[PDB]
Amino acid sequence: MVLYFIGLGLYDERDITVKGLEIAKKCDYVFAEFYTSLMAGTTLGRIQKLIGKEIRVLSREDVELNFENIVLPMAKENDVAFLTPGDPLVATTHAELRIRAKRAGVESYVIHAPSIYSAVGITGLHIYKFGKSATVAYPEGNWFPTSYYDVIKENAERGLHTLLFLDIKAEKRMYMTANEAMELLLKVEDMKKGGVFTDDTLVVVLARAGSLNPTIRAGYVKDLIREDFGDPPHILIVPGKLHIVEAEYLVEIAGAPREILRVNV
Amino acid sequence: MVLYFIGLGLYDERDITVKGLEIAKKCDYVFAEFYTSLMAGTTLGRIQKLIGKEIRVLSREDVELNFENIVLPMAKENDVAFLTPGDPLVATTHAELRIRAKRAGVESYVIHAPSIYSAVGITGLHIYKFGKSATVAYPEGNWFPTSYYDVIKENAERGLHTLLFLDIKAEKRMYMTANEAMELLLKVEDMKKGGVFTDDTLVVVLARAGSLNPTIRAGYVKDLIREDFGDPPHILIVPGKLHIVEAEYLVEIAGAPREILRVNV
Numbered sequence A, B: 001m002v003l004y005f006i007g008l009g010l011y012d013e014r015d016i017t018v019k020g021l022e023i024a025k026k027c028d029y030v031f032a033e034f035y036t037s038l039m040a041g042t043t044l045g046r047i048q049k050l051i052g053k054e055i056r057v058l059s060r061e062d063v064e065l066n067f068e069n070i071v072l073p074m075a076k077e078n079d080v081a082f083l084t085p086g087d088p089l090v091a092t093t094h095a096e097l098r099i100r101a102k103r104a105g106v107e108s109y110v111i112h113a114p115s116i117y118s119a120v121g122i123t124g125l126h127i128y129k130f131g132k133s134a135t136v137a138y139p140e141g142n143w144f145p146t147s148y149y150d151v152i153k154e155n156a157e158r159g160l161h162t163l164l165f166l167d168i169k170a171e172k173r174m175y176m177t178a179n180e181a182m183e184l185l186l187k188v189e190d191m192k193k194g195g196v197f198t199d200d201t202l203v204v205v206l207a208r209a210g211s212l213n214p215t216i217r218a219g220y221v222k223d224l225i226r227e228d229f230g231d232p233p234h235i236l237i238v239p240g241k242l243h244i245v246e247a248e249y250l251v252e253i254a255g256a257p258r259e260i261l262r263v264n265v
């Protein structure tokens, strides 16, 4: 009679919460989407095996245009689950789907899971110091998105860190690397010349958070722009003003140049 | 000879991830801390029962001053777990603990779990719109801290939302309620008179995130300041200007007054 939004976590099927698993195991029908993010350490089959159910995967169009025609009708006679990578409501437009559920007279519940938004903590950067977040989107035809550059500028101006979600074209199986994001940013800098992102800018890369051995690297763009950070997904972070201990962690844990230990308070 | 930082998640004993539970079960020693936050929807006994391991609770001093003398030694010839509410390394001083591990020749791994930082997405407010975060601290003696006031001001000025953690005294199990936080902010407003937090300010209250039945309320301070939001912990958010979709979610899901559709958009 109800609908469950259940997050599956960062990397593999075991990143789901115990609460999410027990409820999913008992749902009559299970739907899911895998276009809002990439869970690099698992497969649909493994997820199905864990939950013990068949999973009908939906495309962005199925969801955005037909959620109330495909999923909601099932929640009327049965308990339905809608699975998503990471946390279902983080950096997705899935929250609006709860409004659709309400309008169809369907109660909905949300089961959270680890999200890349909080996983940034593993970078050593104080999470309360992050400012506005942004997404580095692939240019399309003659359209070249640049707003994410202004976000960095605004945050850096305030000494705040900037989290940069990276683009994804699931149907093309394309996942933007931190390298590609850095190249795009350098191109925007050349254009706006704001001194926001250059070869000397310190950045942090977090790849495959959720895995036991994620890649966590910190350093100057000039040195990292061509470094191999491993398979996607990746996120790029442009730190603002660093606290001594943040710098220490970046150096000791993320292999940053010891020279960043010296902060210009 | 491995140290596992494992998150317990949001509310109860089922908020830990499958990965976290299975790893904890394989550890010879299990430590935990409940001074940064408490699992209001469960008990140490229930957590111990679920993990099937005795759990040695550590105080703030045990961790901050003697982590290397209590936890790390056991990690030399055994697998050790350090459990914390939410997602590991979110609490400001925890990231540094990994440096201590490295210095002691101990490998450490992070097992993520849901954090309030990402769980607040259930309020319908877009995650990318959150700015710098802060904690509302009780004034005391001749000390009247107000920086959290300035954080709200700077975020809202840039159309960003402000996540506010409320004061907590874990040992004495004493919580600051959303109501108290609002009263405090009004008091700060009367002093700084910056037009940042008044009776007409729109706020959102999230209680018991993680529970299947959390309290999500949105409205003006003059109407919510004396409302009962249930048992703690409470999380207070001062949204910046709203996207119409954010406002609609707040109205349809959090019972916000229709008025916000024209006043705060």
Ligand SMILES: Nc1ncnc2c1ncn2[C@@H]1O[C@H](CSCC[C@H](N)C(=O)O)[C@@H](O)[C@H]1O
Pocket (backbone or CB within 6 Å): A010, A011, A036, A037, A038, A085, A086, A087, A088, A089, A090, A091, A092, A114, A115, A116, A117, A164, A165, A166, A167, A168, A206, A207, A208, A209, A210, A233, A234, A235, B118
């Ligand atoms: N495990 C992971 N490691 C690194 N980046 C990740 C990641 N999971 C998600 N991301 C980042 O976030 C983007 C998808 S945004 C959707 C996020 C999701 N709801 C969550 O809660 O995490 C990806 O393109 C990538 O840049």
